[PDB]
């Protein structure tokens, strides 16, 4: 068997079946979605790395990711992404 190679396909699939509960998705669009998620991950984590190194911090907190989201994403997308992320962090710390 080939060595395990992780991918974001299953998650993007669950998000698609929540949002559009009857549509499918091609495998090429799947690879596009996987590379999109990886690219935005690299962008936000790189800006968080820069934010931790600028302020002489050694940890990446939710504040560094939140500020990196405000820097990377455009305006209304950034407000809604900050709202969804804060909602998820509160739901995580409450449980």
């Amino acid at each position: 068997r080939k060595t395990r190679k992780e991918s974001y396909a299953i998650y993007v699939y669950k998000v698609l079946k929540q949002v559009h509960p009857d549509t499918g998705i091609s495998s090429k669009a799947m690879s596009i979605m996987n590379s999109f998620v990886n690219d935005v991950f690299e962008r936000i984590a790189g800006e968080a790395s820069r934010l931790a190194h600028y302020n002489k911090r050694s940890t990446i907190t939710s504040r560094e990711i939140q500020t990196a989201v405000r820097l990377l994403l455009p305006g209304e997308l950034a407000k809604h992404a900050v709202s969804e992320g804060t909602k998820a962090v509160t739901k995580y710390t409450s449980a």
Binding site: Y11, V19, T23, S26, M33, R57, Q66, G85, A88, Y92
Partner: protein
């Protein structure tokens, strides 16, 4: 005795907080990674995926093809204003372009 439990379920997420946390630690982004950072980041990735997939599903419904092809993602990204600003220096393969013709080329 908490035999079955995950972090994504606690944070009400589908995206893996464990994989995101492992990628943040193995990516050499910092010396340490806080506990809420992969939760917040997986939520942001989930929101951006939901926005692009929502607009691509609307494009697919408009084009009457159920499956999402690269053309529908390209139409969704280039037709949204703020997603085109996020992905302005990004080529989506097999995506084509927006059907835009300048007005001075259209005839009488």
């Amino acid at each position: 005795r908490a035999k079955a439990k995950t972090r994504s379920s606690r944070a009400g997420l589908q995206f893996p907080v464990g994989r995101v946390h492992r990628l943040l630690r193995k990516g050499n982004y910092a010396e340490r990674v806080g506990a809420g950072a992969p939760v917040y980041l997986a939520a942001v990735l989930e929101y951006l995926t939901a926005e692009i997939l929502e607009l691509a599903g609307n494009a697919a419904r408009d084009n009457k093809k159920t499956r999402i092809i690269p053309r529908h993602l390209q139409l969704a990204v280039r037709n949204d204003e703020e997603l085109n600003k996020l992905l302005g220096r990004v080529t989506i393969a097999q995506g084509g372009v927006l059907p835009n013709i300048q007005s001075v080329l259209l005839p009488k």
